[PDB]
Design an enzyme around this catalytic site. Structure first.
Site, PDB file in Angstrom:
ATOM      1  N   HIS A  60       0.796  -1.291   0.045  1.00 56.18           N
ATOM      2  CA  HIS A  60       0.084  -0.046   0.074  1.00 56.18           C
ATOM      3  C   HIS A  60       0.663   1.189   0.099  1.00 56.18           C
ATOM      4  O   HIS A  60       1.697   1.433   0.973  1.00 56.18           O
ATOM      5  CB  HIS A  60      -0.796  -0.028   1.268  1.00 56.18           C
ATOM      6  CG  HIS A  60      -1.900   1.063   1.278  1.00 56.18           C
ATOM      7  ND1 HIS A  60      -2.830   1.222   0.295  1.00 56.18           N
ATOM      8  CD2 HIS A  60      -2.106   2.009   1.989  1.00 56.18           C
ATOM      9  CE1 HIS A  60      -3.666   2.107   0.689  1.00 56.18           C
ATOM     10  NE2 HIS A  60      -3.314   2.676   1.513  1.00 56.18           N
ATOM     11  N   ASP A  62       0.825   5.109  -0.165  1.00 58.45           N
ATOM     12  CA  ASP A  62      -0.174   6.373  -0.165  1.00 58.45           C
ATOM     13  C   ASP A  62       0.707   7.710  -0.859  1.00 58.45           C
ATOM     14  O   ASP A  62       1.793   7.484  -0.650  1.00 58.45           O
ATOM     15  CB  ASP A  62      -0.454   6.606   1.213  1.00 58.45           C
ATOM     16  CG  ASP A  62      -1.370   5.831   2.168  1.00 58.45           C
ATOM     17  OD1 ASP A  62      -2.543   5.646   1.429  1.00 58.45           O
ATOM     18  OD2 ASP A  62      -0.916   5.158   2.825  1.00 58.45           O
TER      19      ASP A  62
HETATM   20  O1  LIG Z   1      -2.118   3.513  11.289  1.00 59.26           O
HETATM   21  S1  LIG Z   1      -0.726   2.919  10.912  1.00 59.26           S
HETATM   22  O2  LIG Z   1      -0.576   1.889  12.052  1.00 59.26           O
HETATM   23  O3  LIG Z   1       0.459   3.508  11.063  1.00 59.26           O
HETATM   24  O4  LIG Z   1      -0.643   1.940   9.816  1.00 59.26           O
HETATM   25  C1  LIG Z   1      -1.937   1.065   9.228  1.00 59.26           C
HETATM   26  C2  LIG Z   1      -1.220  -0.571   9.127  1.00 59.26           C
HETATM   27  O5  LIG Z   1      -0.300  -0.574   8.139  1.00 59.26           O
HETATM   28  C3  LIG Z   1      -2.450   1.957   7.956  1.00 59.26           C
HETATM   29  O6  LIG Z   1      -3.562   0.839   7.968  1.00 59.26           O
HETATM   30  C4  LIG Z   1      -2.846   3.094   8.149  1.00 59.26           C
HETATM   31  S2  LIG Z   1      -3.931   3.782   6.910  1.00 59.26           S
HETATM   32  C5  LIG Z   1      -2.871   4.331   5.507  1.00 59.26           C
HETATM   33  C6  LIG Z   1      -3.245   5.735   5.270  1.00 59.26           C
HETATM   34  O7  LIG Z   1      -3.615   6.156   3.910  1.00 59.26           O
HETATM   35  C7  LIG Z   1      -4.545   5.991   6.086  1.00 59.26           C
HETATM   36  O8  LIG Z   1      -4.873   7.344   6.429  1.00 59.26           O
HETATM   37  C8  LIG Z   1      -4.380   5.360   7.644  1.00 59.26           C
HETATM   38  C9  LIG Z   1      -5.800   5.401   8.193  1.00 59.26           C
HETATM   39  O9  LIG Z   1      -5.534   4.573   9.401  1.00 59.26           O
HETATM   40 ZN   LIG Z   2      -3.975   4.596   2.413  1.00 59.61          ZN
END
Ligand SMILES: [O-]S([O-])([O-])O[C@H](CO)[C@@H](O)C[S@+]1C[C@@H](O)[C@H](O)[C@H]1CO
Ligand SMILES: [Zn+2]
Ligand SMILES: *[C@@H]1O[C@H](CO)[C@@H](O)[C@H](O)[C@H]1NC(C)=O
EC number: 3.2.1.114
Length: 1014
Positions: A60, A62
């Protein structure tokens, strides 16, 4: 054409009906926290019926979130793509899917030719597969369908050109909730399958229990089912590896081989992954296969999808090895141990779907039909993600402004073929890509870090400038005698004048037209109308004298009105918010009439005294303790008075009454009719002092909103023959109600300042007996019926308001249209409310790592339409859709696609013409040319121009049809040699059209046509 009003579709799952029935209890389901302990019959699978398992590696990426697009590309993504190329090249059976084309394109153009050829070969052979293929994986809540289509087209056009592939399967694992606008657009763009992930945990449980996680998703009004798109909803809490191998994350985490110390990652369930060996492979396989069989119980076929990835994964070479090698060991063991009755392998998304449909065709499964949406998302307990429907509202409004400038620039420049030196294609490509990038689910959603929001804003600013250059060069060419036309492609022939962006009180950016006997007596201005019907709209310009008259190019006088230029100031000395009038600049307002997709020129001329056809508005400042307000040459003296209720009526339109605080209290539609109670009120929501805190994503109010204490605000009343208004300086908001003869326009200059942990909401209170029903739109494309549920918390009843919302009873409807996406609801019968801005000190634990404290002044705009609807033919009580009236739809178009205004920059315009497009067909009001785009450069022998035609559906309320000509876009340009219906991205020809005529489309349908010219 299907009737989209009178026939209620018969579907297996209708989301509004499912919501009415579901209990939403959040109980601990065990290792699958939000489900139950899945059990399966080991005898289900055997030598003649094996479980086919596809493990799909993914990463993924972003396009901006906690780092900007370029920072991520440099630190992570170029390495991920470079290492994917090497590893897939070297390991023939390894696979990988890629979604974000903005990044792929950035990477690909930096590759040397040998590597570009290697990359094309691993895509050609099926090892690297693109999913969706859009510039980004867009937000589905705030995005307008036109921009969702724009970014999908930008990425797929690049893929077709450079990779020679067009994805027919979509992958959307991160948008926060999902919209049916996606399958709508995708199914009309050649797609056959789509996958979604972030849906309420209660919905996942409910559909899993019925094995309805895979369904044919059709539009809410589609009785026949031709809009249906096969959809796979993932069942668990995240797309990460711990939540994708099966129900128990403590076990799945042990199969994310990147979580063994040297990478800085670990399993929060406290059992780490263990390298697979000959001595533990049987026990490891037994655990993994059991997870797989449990996940398989939630679906109908013997083909199982196991995504294998997470954010910015597959970066290090050591990571590729550790994931690949361990899984290859597991597959070799599992596939050779007949007792598991499993065949597992790396695969792509399309391979999974192809196998599912092969099972379906073998009569192995039948899939349910479903209509509805998946908002508002909650990933756990009461954490509903309705905050991002409003976060960073300045950029959400900017999105709609750029949306329109892109359409206008592409349309104005499409009429001609341009020399490469004009850099038209270059500027349009930059504008489309920057707007497309912002459709990202951390872009328009307002969920990125501060410096990333700044990067998106700078990119959109660059895109706006590119649009203006293309538009002004186009206007000059379209309205100048051809034998006189002498373009300097770097020269600014016209300056765009925009009254609502950034907006008064946001940025003093508008140029004043300076006229004077000793400098310049007159000035040409030009209006453009991107809509395919003749349109009249009032336009205003700043002028250096109040003594200005307007004429058209036949020199006919045009009635005009001059008003002062008023600016509001928070006076830190008197501690009041009050207006100051300019003594050097004035506003001139007049009605412009412009041809369908055309241009109309006017002239403003100064005189030494009051011109015959220009009137002057009166102005009344209501406040205790007034001081003088001189206005230079303005001919009417400002009047003063103590605050009091007032009433105004422009033209024969409605009569509006206001309270002594300057807020609407009633609307009277005609001289006879009653004064219908419609009250505007501003309130505020706070943040909880215990428990979870609201942040960029989550809305967690500490109860119902409290009224903003107003004090005795200063109210300014301007009354003119063409336009009147009432403006009031409230704390954090200069609220304005503008009247031009029809439904009023409302503008809020919102400056939440330093009000921490506060969300400002604008509410309308009426006596309309709506009960618990209200309507909101999805991506500016359709209106869906909402039902307020008291069994859910306040924040769960908030929904995206991308462009409009309404309430109604048997006789009356109130519709609020918006020029920007914001969040809103109807929390009590007779009410509508929409959030203006929110400033939150805390992070809400979804990875952003900060609150939202970067607010800035934003000018929100709306149209407020009160109407009698008892004579309208409406959908039955069981229909899940709603439809606008003609007046509400036109009001929405006035906000999103207003006339564009151009001021001639030099002193004299030689060869100027008065109009363009007077012979263009004025199509029926429900039809729009959403996109007009020339698809070929000037060297192409056969020129091609693409059109996207959309027909909405407006209620029949008794107003006789009338006139209108059929619009055949294929004959808008001369010398047409062919006309073809194509997918919405223009990438595939679907039909060769007889007589080279593009037929119009049906209500709620969208089609694309391409005309070829010799
Ligand atoms: O939130 S964090 O733990 O850093 O990462 C997660 C697990 O890999 C991702 O799902 C985060 S998603 C990735 C980003 O585009 C979204 O705004 C996040 C909303 O939570
Ligand atoms: Zn995302
Ligand atoms: C592009 O793909 C098609 C099949 O999908 C193939 O026949 C063609 O040769 C490829 N390249 C071309 C000719 O554009």
């Amino acid at each position: 054409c299907q009737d989209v009003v009178q026939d209620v579709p018969n579907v297996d799952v209708q989301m509004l009906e499912l919501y009415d029935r579901m209990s939403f209890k959040d109980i601990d389901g065990g290792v699958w926290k939000q489900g139950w302990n899945i059990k399966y019959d080991p005898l289900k699978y055997n030598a003649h019926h094996k479980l086919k398992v596809f493990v799909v590696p993914h990463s993924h990426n972003d396009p901006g979130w906690i780092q900007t697009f370029e920072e991520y590309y440099q630190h992570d993504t170029k390495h991920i793509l470079s290492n994917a190329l090497r590893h897939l090249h070297d390991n023939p059976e390894m696979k990988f899917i890629w979604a974000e084309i903005s990044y792929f394109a950035r990477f690909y153009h930096d590759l040397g030719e040998n590597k570009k050829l290697q990359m094309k070969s691993i895509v050609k052979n099926g090892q690297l597969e693109f999913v969706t293929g859009g510039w980004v994986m867009p937000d589905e809540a705030n995005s307008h369908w036109r921009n969702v289509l724009l970014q999908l087209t930008e990425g797929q056009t690049w893929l077709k050109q450079f990779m020679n592939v067009t994805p027919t399967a979509s992958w959307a694992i991160d948008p926060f909730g999902h919209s049916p606008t996606m399958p709508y657009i995708l199914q009309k763009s050649g797609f056959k399958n789509m996958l979604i992930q972030r849906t309420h945990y209660s919905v996942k449980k409910e559909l899993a229990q019925q094995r309805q996680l895979e369904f044919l998703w059709r539009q809410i009004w589609d009785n026949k089912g031709d809009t249906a798109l096969f959809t796979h909803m993932m069942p668990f809490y995240s797309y990460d590896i711990p939540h994708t191998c099966g129900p128990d994350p403590k076990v799945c985490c042990q199969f994310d081989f990147k979580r063994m110390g040297s990478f800085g990652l670990s399993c929060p369930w406290k059992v780490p992954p263990r390298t697979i060996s000959d001595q533990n492979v049987a026990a490891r396989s037994d655990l993994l296969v059991d997870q797989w069989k449990k996940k398989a119980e939630l679906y109908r076929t013997n083909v199982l999808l196991i995504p294998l990835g997470d954010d910015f994964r597959f970066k290090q070479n050591t990571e590729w090895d550790v994931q690949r090698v361990n899984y290859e060991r597991l597959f070799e063991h599992i596939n050779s141990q007949a007792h598991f009755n499993v065949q597992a392998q790396f695969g792509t998304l399309q391979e999974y779907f192809d196998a599912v449909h092969q099972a379906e065709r073998a009569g192995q499964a039948e899939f349910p039909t479903l209509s509805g949406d998946f908002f508002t998302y909650a990933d756990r307990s009461d954490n509903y993600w309705s905050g991002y429907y409003t976060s960073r509202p300045y950029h959400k409004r900017m999105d709609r402004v750029l949306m329109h400038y892109v359409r206008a620039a592409e349309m104005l420049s499409a009429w001609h073929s341009w020399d490469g030196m004009a850099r038209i294609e270059e500027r349009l490509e930059q504008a489309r890509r920057e707007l497309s990038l912002f459709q990202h689910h951390d872009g328009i959603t307002g969920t990125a870090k501060t410096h990333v929001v700044v990067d998106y804003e700078q990119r959109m600013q660059e895109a706006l400038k590119a649009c203006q250059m293309v538009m002004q060069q186009s206007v000059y060419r379209l309205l100048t005698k051809p034998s006189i036309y002498s373009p300097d492609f770097s020269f600014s022939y016209f300056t765009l004048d925009d009254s609502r962006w950034p907006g008064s009180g946001v940025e003093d950016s508008r140029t004043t037209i300076i006229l004077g006997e000793d400098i310049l007596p007159s000035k040409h201005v030009v209006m453009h109308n991107t809509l395919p019907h003749w349109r009249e709209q009032l336009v205003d310009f700043y002028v250096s004298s109040p003594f200005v008259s307007v004429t058209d190019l036949a020199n006919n006088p045009v009635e005009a009105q001059v008003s002062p230029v008023w600016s509001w100031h928070h006076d830190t000395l008197t501690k009041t918010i009050h207006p100051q009038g300019s003594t050097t600049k004035y506003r001139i307002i007049f009605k412009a009439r412009v041809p369908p997709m055309g241009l109309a020129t006017y002239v403003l001329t100064i005189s030494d005294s009051k011109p015959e056809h220009t009137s002057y508005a009166s102005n009344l400042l209501l406040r205790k303790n007034p001081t003088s307000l001189p206005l230079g040459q303005y001919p009417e003296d400002v009047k003063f008075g103590d605050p009091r209720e007032i009433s105004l009526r422009v033209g024969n339109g409605p009569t509006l009454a206001f309270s002594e605080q300057g807020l609407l209290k009633s609307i009277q539609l005609t001289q006879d009719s009653p004064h219908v109670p419609v009250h505007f009120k501003f309130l505020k929501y706070g943040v909880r002092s215990h428990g979870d805190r609201s942040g960029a994503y989550l809305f967690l109010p500490n109860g119902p909103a409290s009224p903003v204490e107003l004090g005795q605000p200063v109210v300014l009343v301007t009354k003119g023959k063409l336009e009147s208004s009432v403006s009031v300086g409230l704390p954090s908001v200069v609220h304005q109600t503008i009247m031009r003869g029809g439904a009023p326009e409302i503008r809020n200059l919102v400056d939440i300042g330093s009000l921490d942990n506060t969300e400002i909401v604008m509410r309308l209170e009426t006596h309309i007996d709506s009960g618990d029903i209200f309507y909101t739109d999805l991506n500016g494309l359709q209106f869906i019926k909402r039902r307020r549920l008291d069994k859910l918390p306040l924040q769960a009843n908030y929904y995206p308001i991308p462009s409009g919302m309404f309430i109604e009873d048997a006789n009356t409807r109130l519709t609020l249209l918006t020029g920007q996406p914001l969040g809103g609801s109807s929390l009590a019968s007779g009410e509508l409310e929409i959030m203006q801005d929110r400033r939150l000190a805390s992070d809400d634990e979804r990875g952003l790592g900060q609150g939202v404290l970067d607010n800035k002044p934003v000018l929100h705009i709306y149209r407020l339409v009160l109407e009698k609807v008892n004579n309208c033919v409406r959908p039955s009580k069981l229909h899940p859709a709603g439809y606008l009236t003609s007046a509400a739809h036109k009001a929405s178009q006035s906000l999103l696609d207003p006339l564009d205004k151009f001021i001639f920059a030099e002193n004299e315009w030689i060869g100027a013409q008065g109009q363009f497009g007077g012979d263009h067909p004025s199509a029926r009001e429900d039809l729009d040319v959403s996109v007009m785009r020339r698809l070929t450069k000037s060297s192409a022998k056969t020129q091609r121009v693409g059109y996207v035609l959309h027909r909405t559906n407006l209620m029949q309320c008794g107003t006789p049809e009338e006139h209108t000509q059929k619009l055949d876009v294929c004959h808008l340009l001369p010398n047409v040699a062919r006309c073809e219906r194509t997918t919405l991205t223009f990438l595939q020809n679907l039909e060769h059209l007889d007589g080279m005529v593009a037929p119009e489309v049906c209500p709620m349908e969208t089609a694309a046509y391409v005309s070829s010219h010799s």
